[PDB]
Amino acid sequence: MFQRSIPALITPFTKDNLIDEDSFVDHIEWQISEGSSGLVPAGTTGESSTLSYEEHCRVVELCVKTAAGRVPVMAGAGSNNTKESIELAQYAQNTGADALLVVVPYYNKPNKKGLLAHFGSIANAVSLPIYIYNNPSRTVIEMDVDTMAELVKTYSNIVGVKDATGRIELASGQRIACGSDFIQLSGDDSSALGFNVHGGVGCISVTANVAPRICAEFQKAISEGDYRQALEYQDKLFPLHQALFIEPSISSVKYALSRLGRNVSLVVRAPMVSILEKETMFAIDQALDHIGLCAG
Amino acid sequence: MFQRSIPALITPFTKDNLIDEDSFVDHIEWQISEGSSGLVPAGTTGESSTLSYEEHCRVVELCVKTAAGRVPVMAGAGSNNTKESIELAQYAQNTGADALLVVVPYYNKPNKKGLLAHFGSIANAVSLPIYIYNNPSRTVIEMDVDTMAELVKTYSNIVGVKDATGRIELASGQRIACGSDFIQLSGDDSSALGFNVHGGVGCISVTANVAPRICAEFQKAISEGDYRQALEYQDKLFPLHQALFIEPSISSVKYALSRLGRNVSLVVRAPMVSILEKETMFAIDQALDHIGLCAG
Numbered sequence: 001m002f003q004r005s006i007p008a009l010i011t012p013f014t015k016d017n018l019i020d021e022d023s024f025v026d027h028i029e030w031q032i033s034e035g036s037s038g039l040v041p042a043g044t045t046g047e048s049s050t051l052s053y054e055e056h057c058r059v060v061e062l063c064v065k066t067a068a069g070r071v072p073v074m075a076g077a078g079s080n081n082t083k084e085s086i087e088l089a090q091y092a093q094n095t096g097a098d099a100l101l102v103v104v105p106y107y108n109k110p111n112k113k114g115l116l117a118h119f120g121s122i123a124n125a126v127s128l129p130i131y132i133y134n135n136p137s138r139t140v141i142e143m144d145v146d147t148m149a150e151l152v153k154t155y156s157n158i159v160g161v162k163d164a165t166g167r168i169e170l171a172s173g174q175r176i177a178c179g180s181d182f183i184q185l186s187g188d189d190s191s192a193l194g195f196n197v198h199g200g201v202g203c204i205s206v207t208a209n210v211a212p213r214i215c216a217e218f219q220k221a222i223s224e225g226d227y228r229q230a231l232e233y234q235d236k237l238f239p240l241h242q243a244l245f246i247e248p249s250i251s252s253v254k255y256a257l258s259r260l261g262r263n264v265s266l267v268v269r270a271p272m273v274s275i276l277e278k279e280t281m282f283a284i285d286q287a288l289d290h291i292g293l294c295a296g
Numbered sequence: 297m298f299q300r301s302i303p304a305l306i307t308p309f310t311k312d313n314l315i316d317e318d319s320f321v322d323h324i325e326w327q328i329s330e331g332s333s334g335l336v337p338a339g340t341t342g343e344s345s346t347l348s349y350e351e352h353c354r355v356v357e358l359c360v361k362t363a364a365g366r367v368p369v370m371a372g373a374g375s376n377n378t379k380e381s382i383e384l385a386q387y388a389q390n391t392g393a394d395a396l397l398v399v400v401p402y403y404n405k406p407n408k409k410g411l412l413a414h415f416g417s418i419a420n421a422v423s424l425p426i427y428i429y430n431n432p433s434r435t436v437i438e439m440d441v442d443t444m445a446e447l448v449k450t451y452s453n454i455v456g457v458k459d460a461t462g463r464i465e466l467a468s469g470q471r472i473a474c475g476s477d478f479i480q481l482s483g484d485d486s487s488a489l490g491f492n493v494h495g496g497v498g499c500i501s502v503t504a505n506v507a508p509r510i511c512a513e514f515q516k517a518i519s520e521g522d523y524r525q526a527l528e529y530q531d532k533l534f535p536l537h538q539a540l541f542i543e544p545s546i547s548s549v550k551y552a553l554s555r556l557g558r559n560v561s562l563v564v565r566a567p568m569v570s571i572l573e574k575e576t577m578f579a580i581d582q583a584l585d586h587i588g589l590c591a592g
């Protein structure tokens with residue numbers, strides 16, 4: 001269901017700090033027309049953390065309605081509060097999402113028994129497919145492979161992972177422990193290539209917000225097994241992947257989209273700030289121009 | 297104003313998962329009469345992550361009303377959403393708290409400019425004193441000494457830190473950069489002793505929930521400079537400090553309280569669980585015995 005290039009969508013805001021619904025719709029429609037294969041609304045890159053419950057819901061609802069069944073929609077539905085996670089998950093299901101992205105809880109550092117309680121309680125509350133989002137560089141704790149295997153064996157609707165560790169040995173470990181039917185998606189743009197040759201089938205990408213066509217061509221070459229050509233795309237994209245997290249990628253992505261002429265404002269919600277260092281903007285600009293993304 | 301032993305109060309829950317207000321009030325009265333010098337409601341040990349906005353406000357208000365001026369109340373106003381922190385801080389001010397505890401944002405990983413925006417925005421929205429809560433073992437990012445010193449120099453109501461790093465060389469660096477009027481409180485029970493000799497004046501403690509009297513006598517000895525007696529207290533408290541975070545401390549503390557006979561249920565909110573391993577319960581029990589606290 002989910003494969004190849006899947007953007008973790010930004011959430012654009014207006015000058016008055018409302019959800020820029022028009023810009024969000026245009027972004028989705030542009031992403032699809034450029035070759036993105038699925039959508040993740042209200043994830044990390046979507047500034048989930050600074051959305052109200054009702055904004056989060058509205059963002060998922062809007063993304064589902066815009067996609068119009070052309071590509072699958074994996075709703076962000078995870079916080080570090082299980083009850084709230086269940087509420088976001090059931091909303092996503094009732095509004096028509098195709099699947100759920102559920103992060104390992106951040107900040108309160110549950111132990112393994114808590115992870116089993118968290119994901120198990122969510123899996124029992126919806127019938128949608130659930131993707132475990134493992135990102136220790138933000139959550140500190142890391143779900144280990146025994147726990148992930150245990151969840152897959154226990155809950156039929158826990159069906160894959162987003163693996164943002166960037167340590168691709170874990171892709172081999174997860175493939176062996178959870179089965180080759182377990183759907184592995186990279187959560188780290190810069191190692192997405194090797195992740196797939198170890199068994200991944202796509203990437204939930206930051207960079208695809210900014211460069212969806214070549215990210216899509218990149219993932220298409222991999223799925224055709226043209227790895228020589230995938231390596232040529234990697235050398236072109238890698239400087240951009242890197243330039244976009246010199247500072248928080250949410251700021252950097254909106255900076256780049258606005259530079260490219262997309263109708264996306266620079267506004268972000270605190271504690272993100274839109275002001276970038278000049279060295280950062282210069283790195284992003286050079287990487288964009290090396291790919292040749294400026295129309296004019 | 298804030299000094300010696302200050303418990304990060306647990307939030308007790310009923311069997312039906314409501315806030316157990318009578319238990320919370322009783323815990324506060326007990327804490328005060330056993331010699332705790334301040335209270336921090338709705339911090340990390342308070343399970344702030346799993347309180348609704350309303351319940352968080354209720355915990356703070358109920359703590360303020362119970363304390364009734366006897367000891368100062370430093371309300372938890374932390375989240376990784378700046379707008380929400382402002383609302384929590386303004387609720388705390390309007391309900392009568394004496395100060396605010398504000399964690400460095402977790403999960404979304406702001407950079408230095410984001411920290412200045414986050415803490416600056418909060419300092420502009422309230423007139424209460426603010427304590428920076430630095431805990432990179434949960435937030436990943438760590439506020440550095442230059443950023444702290446700049447906040448302190450810029451905003452008159454940024455007055456202190458909770459320094460939960462447990463690297464006490466930072467207490468020296470923060471003392472020199474921010475000045476000796478800067479109020480430094482340890483956020484790490486096991487190194488509170490050395491933290492104070494480097495310039496700290498108290499501890500926001502997990503263990504004080506369980507053994508408020510001994511922790512109070514421990515901090516009293518330090519403030520009188522009887523460091524020989526303080527080391528004697530450290531040797532008796534250290535096994536309890538360590539036993540309480542074998543597994544998550546919020547579960548471990550509530551288990552310890554019930555083994556002491558207090559009216560605190562074991563209920564915690566997912567993704568925390570109350571089940572502890574046999575070895576964890578035994579390590580806590582023996583640590584409690586070693587302080588004669590229960591057996592002798």
Ligand SMILES: *[C@@H](C[C@H](O)CCC(=O)O)C(=O)O
Nearest residue numbers: 008043044045164187188204
């Ligand atoms: C997933 C896409 C990326 O994994 C974000 C990675 C990061 O840590 O910045 C998402 O939910 O954004």
Ligand SMILES: *[C@@H](C[C@H](O)CCC(=O)O)C(=O)O
Nearest residue numbers: 304339340341460483484500
């Ligand atoms: C502050 C007290 C401690 O630093 C908690 C220690 C931990 O990281 O668990 C608080 O807000 O609980």
